[PDB]
């Protein structure tokens, strides 16, 4: 209950929220039904519209006007945005040439360039090119400022998860907003779009920019705008705030447009009805820049024009129903649409079983338009698992489709022609980023980047220290003229041992055999050199990875590869090797098929054993450096050392063998040599972070050999591929993956076919950033290159997406 008897008289859009129940006059009062009786009358004036006309010039101030064209309006800070154009013969901002903004040109008493975030809902990246004829103001921001061809949103590509990721720098799994609709089983509470539950603070985790700014003494305008406040009034309110006295005036502001998303849902992303909403957005940008120009702020403010996600063509006919798959359809709750999330309808149902729900949903129809996953098996690049609000069973829905529980849900709850929410690597879900202002670069294009990185830069723009977040601070320094953040590489925590030969063959009792007893300081001085690091510069191109946690490990050198071998996990953390364009693929000789060899540098006590693998009927083993790529028959024996072996399910060995035997050489051919770093990942609590030894849930039977949940590889070459990967003088090019180590290939519906028809598609789906691997392994890569550290941070956040080029 609000006592709405006070007045908004001189308090319209006041910046401090007054507490219940004195009545409110802010942009949130509508939402709370708490506005004073006279809010509409005083604060939402509309009389005469939004533009000055010639006859209004010099007019006597009438306070009933929505905005003013009288003489004192500039200093009251409430002229119509077109005032100086119509009444003082100025030009519109968009008609002015652009002129580099080398330094902030701010009125006296500004302590820093203000930041205005202009966010547009559903603005698909390709609208920048496709609607460019109708968006002159936006086009000028983009061509004169700093722009990316697109900005990658987070998954799911829904509105609240992405705006709040923009505000926090966090994955939805960490900030808590994991969908537009949620159930938190600890609170036993549901979050919905329609309602009041959603303002409750416990939903909203992390620290959004307005809080970061406030705690560090920088004032913020309101980030939230009520749907019914027109855009023109939002712009006028921001401009009026920008006229407040120094001590009251915020330094950071946000504007939010419901368009073009709102029309895109009804008409599809390129519906003919979409031109008008894009024109209208542009006219709004124009009104903002004209207003800044009248305030002498158009070369002072940094403006970010940013979207939350794109829009895809989706219609009612393209809906999959779970009632076509499950016999038990009424025992589940589905969160439906462009993603699916499934849990039991009642926790009292002891007959509920996820494994049979998943099996019933797996590769059941030839053309099935969704794929089920337990959340821990989703591609690690989605970072969508570590939150009790995310249901264990997830459905990744194909672009252009929906999932629903039953047909009745769709026709008794087409309505719509656009939607979003799909996998955040999908081209239609990509959105926009333009930065313009003194602090951004002039006429500069930057490569695509992810929206989790912006928070850090918004902090940089405002002189704020960012709260702990998922951006990689420094990876976007190339967008900025000044205020760059110059990080130092993290310090290596554990230093390696460099073991020499210390054990005899007969000290090992590993149950391993190898056909290797047929074997001149010619090729004997030579093999000692190799074991001491002599080819190390060929195979370790960017320095050894640093270990950022406390552990005990050994560096092992070989002719064809180098590894960091963990005495704690009994297998390498990393194995590094270079394959030139000219390298040749060989087969394992018949006599060597089952050969495993003890490594006389590493104690039996810190070695795996073949017995454990014999006894474990589920688990087999693979090798990290592949025997097929050995440089010579003699070198091949090194690839069978017990210290290069790793546990692998037979089903996964099909995937790994095709990668090692076919794809590595294929990449070396295409990229002019590659350097590969591969290793194991252990993430049994699915938090995207390396597991300690006591988190490991599965061991090779009867042994202490931990089973990885994933295997990674990072494949680096020269960005200028006329130079070979081992002699590259400039920027690097990388692609990486984090493959899940699963005992079946159920994820791949074509898996009974030859690996040539399905393994590469699987790998593409599990593409990753090098930074993702760093979190998961506690390693830091690329420590010794000839590149700037910021450029290396950018390379580590790179995601190879495999989508075709954005456009047509
Ligand atoms: C992306 O970036 C983010 C941000 O940097 C990374 O997330 C951080 O990861 C850290 C490691 O997981 C984690 O640190 C922990 O902090 C605990 C205190 O946490 C509270 O305080 C902070 C600070 O204000 C706050 O941010 C937290 O907010 C979380 O929880 C609230 C309420 O649920 C949410 O509103 C909010 O959205 C956020 O949720 C997310 O994080 C939590 C984990 O905290 C998840 O459970 C959620 O699903 C969601 O993902 C908190 O309010 C601190 O208590 C922890 O210390 C324990 O563990 C260590 C183990 O060594 C030990 O030393 C301690 O003694 C303690 O152990 C005891 O508790 C154990 C577990 O209960 C118990 O088993 C033991 O026996 C012990 O008794 C820990 O240090 C940090 O909170 C999050 N921060 C955020 C914002 O998410 C994220 O990792 C990055 N992602 C990637 C891939 O890089
Ligand atoms: O006023 C707002 O914006 C604050 C802001 C700005 C920049 C921000 O970014 C940053 F912090 F970085 F500046 C953060 C918050 N908002 C955002 C909210 C969206 N919404 C929906 O009902 C909704 C909308 C579109 C959908 N499509 N499909 N389902 C949908 C559901 C209410 C709106 C009010
Ligand atoms: Ca076995
Ligand atoms: Ca983990
Ligand atoms: Cl959702
Ligand atoms: Cl299989
Ligand atoms: Cl550990
Ligand atoms: Cl596109
Ligand atoms: Na399969
Ligand atoms: Zn939408």
PDB file of N, CA and C in Angstrom, residues 671-711:
ATOM      1  N   UNK A 671      46.438 -24.474 -43.010  1.00  0.00           N
ATOM      2  CA  UNK A 671      46.922 -23.275 -42.277  1.00  0.00           C
ATOM      3  C   UNK A 671      48.439 -23.071 -42.376  1.00  0.00           C
ATOM      4  N   UNK A 672      49.104 -23.940 -43.160  1.00  0.00           N
ATOM      5  CA  UNK A 672      50.573 -23.886 -43.319  1.00  0.00           C
ATOM      6  C   UNK A 672      51.337 -24.216 -42.007  1.00  0.00           C
ATOM      7  N   UNK A 673      51.104 -25.436 -41.549  1.00  0.00           N
ATOM      8  CA  UNK A 673      51.622 -25.938 -40.316  1.00  0.00           C
ATOM      9  C   UNK A 673      50.634 -25.504 -39.180  1.00  0.00           C
ATOM     10  N   UNK A 674      50.574 -26.320 -38.133  1.00  0.00           N
ATOM     11  CA  UNK A 674      49.896 -25.919 -36.887  1.00  0.00           C
ATOM     12  C   UNK A 674      50.695 -26.329 -35.680  1.00  0.00           C
ATOM     13  N   UNK A 675      50.543 -25.584 -34.577  1.00  0.00           N
ATOM     14  CA  UNK A 675      51.055 -26.068 -33.311  1.00  0.00           C
ATOM     15  C   UNK A 675      49.799 -26.504 -32.548  1.00  0.00           C
ATOM     16  N   UNK A 676      49.913 -27.643 -31.890  1.00  0.00           N
ATOM     17  CA  UNK A 676      48.745 -28.179 -31.171  1.00  0.00           C
ATOM     18  C   UNK A 676      49.150 -28.267 -29.713  1.00  0.00           C
ATOM     19  N   UNK A 677      48.294 -27.785 -28.800  1.00  0.00           N
ATOM     20  CA  UNK A 677      48.402 -28.160 -27.407  1.00  0.00           C
ATOM     21  C   UNK A 677      47.140 -28.888 -27.019  1.00  0.00           C
ATOM     22  N   UNK A 678      47.289 -30.095 -26.471  1.00  0.00           N
ATOM     23  CA  UNK A 678      46.075 -30.858 -26.074  1.00  0.00           C
ATOM     24  C   UNK A 678      46.248 -31.293 -24.644  1.00  0.00           C
ATOM     25  N   UNK A 679      45.145 -31.593 -23.971  1.00  0.00           N
ATOM     26  CA  UNK A 679      45.255 -32.219 -22.696  1.00  0.00           C
ATOM     27  C   UNK A 679      43.886 -32.587 -22.141  1.00  0.00           C
ATOM     28  N   UNK A 680      43.879 -32.998 -20.902  1.00  0.00           N
ATOM     29  CA  UNK A 680      42.636 -33.418 -20.260  1.00  0.00           C
ATOM     30  C   UNK A 680      42.028 -32.241 -19.480  1.00  0.00           C
ATOM     31  N   UNK A 681      40.697 -32.282 -19.244  1.00  0.00           N
ATOM     32  CA  UNK A 681      40.038 -31.316 -18.384  1.00  0.00           C
ATOM     33  C   UNK A 681      39.192 -32.115 -17.361  1.00  0.00           C
ATOM     34  N   UNK A 682      39.199 -31.650 -16.128  1.00  0.00           N
ATOM     35  CA  UNK A 682      38.344 -32.314 -15.082  1.00  0.00           C
ATOM     36  C   UNK A 682      37.424 -31.233 -14.549  1.00  0.00           C
ATOM     37  N   UNK A 683      36.132 -31.341 -14.846  1.00  0.00           N
ATOM     38  CA  UNK A 683      35.131 -30.398 -14.338  1.00  0.00           C
ATOM     39  C   UNK A 683      33.869 -31.199 -13.942  1.00  0.00           C
ATOM     40  N   UNK A 684      34.023 -32.007 -12.902  1.00  0.00           N
ATOM     41  CA  UNK A 684      32.882 -32.763 -12.429  1.00  0.00           C
ATOM     42  C   UNK A 684      31.782 -31.993 -11.774  1.00  0.00           C
ATOM     43  N   UNK A 685      32.033 -30.788 -11.204  1.00  0.00           N
ATOM     44  CA  UNK A 685      30.952 -29.920 -10.672  1.00  0.00           C
ATOM     45  C   UNK A 685      30.519 -28.856 -11.658  1.00  0.00           C
ATOM     46  N   UNK A 686      30.877 -29.049 -12.926  1.00  0.00           N
ATOM     47  CA  UNK A 686      30.379 -28.192 -14.019  1.00  0.00           C
ATOM     48  C   UNK A 686      30.354 -26.692 -13.739  1.00  0.00           C
ATOM     49  N   UNK A 687      31.413 -26.202 -13.109  1.00  0.00           N
ATOM     50  CA  UNK A 687      31.431 -24.739 -12.751  1.00  0.00           C
ATOM     51  C   UNK A 687      32.378 -23.977 -13.682  1.00  0.00           C
ATOM     52  N   UNK A 688      32.885 -24.675 -14.710  1.00  0.00           N
ATOM     53  CA  UNK A 688      33.823 -24.075 -15.722  1.00  0.00           C
ATOM     54  C   UNK A 688      35.218 -23.832 -15.179  1.00  0.00           C
ATOM     55  N   UNK A 689      35.531 -24.341 -13.986  1.00  0.00           N
ATOM     56  CA  UNK A 689      36.778 -24.134 -13.321  1.00  0.00           C
ATOM     57  C   UNK A 689      37.474 -25.442 -13.040  1.00  0.00           C
ATOM     58  N   UNK A 690      38.785 -25.454 -13.071  1.00  0.00           N
ATOM     59  CA  UNK A 690      39.510 -26.721 -12.846  1.00  0.00           C
ATOM     60  C   UNK A 690      39.183 -27.374 -11.499  1.00  0.00           C
ATOM     61  N   UNK A 691      38.973 -28.673 -11.511  1.00  0.00           N
ATOM     62  CA  UNK A 691      38.635 -29.417 -10.307  1.00  0.00           C
ATOM     63  C   UNK A 691      39.924 -29.688  -9.573  1.00  0.00           C
ATOM     64  N   UNK A 692      39.855 -29.614  -8.242  1.00  0.00           N
ATOM     65  CA  UNK A 692      40.923 -30.150  -7.406  1.00  0.00           C
ATOM     66  C   UNK A 692      40.742 -31.690  -7.325  1.00  0.00           C
ATOM     67  N   UNK A 693      41.772 -32.393  -6.864  1.00  0.00           N
ATOM     68  CA  UNK A 693      41.822 -33.863  -6.801  1.00  0.00           C
ATOM     69  C   UNK A 693      40.626 -34.467  -6.059  1.00  0.00           C
ATOM     70  N   UNK A 694      40.171 -33.776  -5.033  1.00  0.00           N
ATOM     71  CA  UNK A 694      39.056 -34.302  -4.221  1.00  0.00           C
ATOM     72  C   UNK A 694      37.663 -34.057  -4.823  1.00  0.00           C
ATOM     73  N   UNK A 695      37.592 -33.483  -6.037  1.00  0.00           N
ATOM     74  CA  UNK A 695      36.287 -33.280  -6.734  1.00  0.00           C
ATOM     75  C   UNK A 695      36.066 -34.342  -7.794  1.00  0.00           C
ATOM     76  N   UNK A 696      37.061 -35.197  -8.018  1.00  0.00           N
ATOM     77  CA  UNK A 696      37.001 -36.154  -9.111  1.00  0.00           C
ATOM     78  C   UNK A 696      36.024 -37.276  -8.771  1.00  0.00           C
ATOM     79  N   UNK A 697      35.013 -37.447  -9.598  1.00  0.00           N
ATOM     80  CA  UNK A 697      33.978 -38.500  -9.326  1.00  0.00           C
ATOM     81  C   UNK A 697      34.199 -39.881  -9.943  1.00  0.00           C
ATOM     82  N   UNK A 698      35.206 -39.998 -10.799  1.00  0.00           N
ATOM     83  CA  UNK A 698      35.432 -41.273 -11.469  1.00  0.00           C
ATOM     84  C   UNK A 698      36.896 -41.484 -11.775  1.00  0.00           C
ATOM     85  N   UNK A 699      37.311 -42.703 -11.513  1.00  0.00           N
ATOM     86  CA  UNK A 699      38.682 -43.188 -11.641  1.00  0.00           C
ATOM     87  C   UNK A 699      38.626 -44.430 -12.533  1.00  0.00           C
ATOM     88  N   UNK A 700      39.725 -44.699 -13.199  1.00  0.00           N
ATOM     89  CA  UNK A 700      39.852 -45.945 -13.906  1.00  0.00           C
ATOM     90  C   UNK A 700      39.804 -47.021 -12.787  1.00  0.00           C
ATOM     91  N   UNK A 701      38.995 -48.037 -13.016  1.00  0.00           N
ATOM     92  CA  UNK A 701      38.689 -49.012 -11.946  1.00  0.00           C
ATOM     93  C   UNK A 701      39.924 -49.605 -11.268  1.00  0.00           C
ATOM     94  N   UNK A 702      39.925 -49.579  -9.941  1.00  0.00           N
ATOM     95  CA  UNK A 702      40.991 -50.191  -9.169  1.00  0.00           C
ATOM     96  C   UNK A 702      42.279 -49.409  -9.266  1.00  0.00           C
ATOM     97  N   UNK A 703      42.186 -48.120  -9.582  1.00  0.00           N
ATOM     98  CA  UNK A 703      43.404 -47.329  -9.711  1.00  0.00           C
ATOM     99  C   UNK A 703      43.091 -45.932  -9.198  1.00  0.00           C
ATOM    100  N   UNK A 704      44.122 -45.099  -9.112  1.00  0.00           N
ATOM    101  CA  UNK A 704      44.042 -43.686  -8.793  1.00  0.00           C
ATOM    102  C   UNK A 704      44.136 -42.813 -10.081  1.00  0.00           C
ATOM    103  N   UNK A 705      43.854 -43.383 -11.220  1.00  0.00           N
ATOM    104  CA  UNK A 705      43.933 -42.620 -12.484  1.00  0.00           C
ATOM    105  C   UNK A 705      42.584 -41.956 -12.669  1.00  0.00           C
ATOM    106  N   UNK A 706      42.540 -40.618 -12.581  1.00  0.00           N
ATOM    107  CA  UNK A 706      41.273 -39.857 -12.685  1.00  0.00           C
ATOM    108  C   UNK A 706      40.750 -39.831 -14.152  1.00  0.00           C
ATOM    109  N   UNK A 707      39.432 -39.861 -14.356  1.00  0.00           N
ATOM    110  CA  UNK A 707      38.925 -39.843 -15.680  1.00  0.00           C
ATOM    111  C   UNK A 707      38.530 -38.386 -16.021  1.00  0.00           C
ATOM    112  N   UNK A 708      39.072 -37.853 -17.124  1.00  0.00           N
ATOM    113  CA  UNK A 708      38.734 -36.496 -17.523  1.00  0.00           C
ATOM    114  C   UNK A 708      37.260 -36.431 -17.966  1.00  0.00           C
ATOM    115  N   UNK A 709      36.650 -35.278 -17.774  1.00  0.00           N
ATOM    116  CA  UNK A 709      35.293 -35.047 -18.266  1.00  0.00           C
ATOM    117  C   UNK A 709      35.409 -34.508 -19.693  1.00  0.00           C
ATOM    118  N   UNK A 710      36.587 -33.992 -20.106  1.00  0.00           N
ATOM    119  CA  UNK A 710      36.716 -33.376 -21.413  1.00  0.00           C
ATOM    120  C   UNK A 710      38.178 -33.491 -21.856  1.00  0.00           C
ATOM    121  N   UNK A 711      38.415 -33.326 -23.173  1.00  0.00           N
ATOM    122  CA  UNK A 711      39.754 -33.200 -23.711  1.00  0.00           C
ATOM    123  C   UNK A 711      39.744 -31.953 -24.554  1.00  0.00           C
TER     124      UNK A 711
END
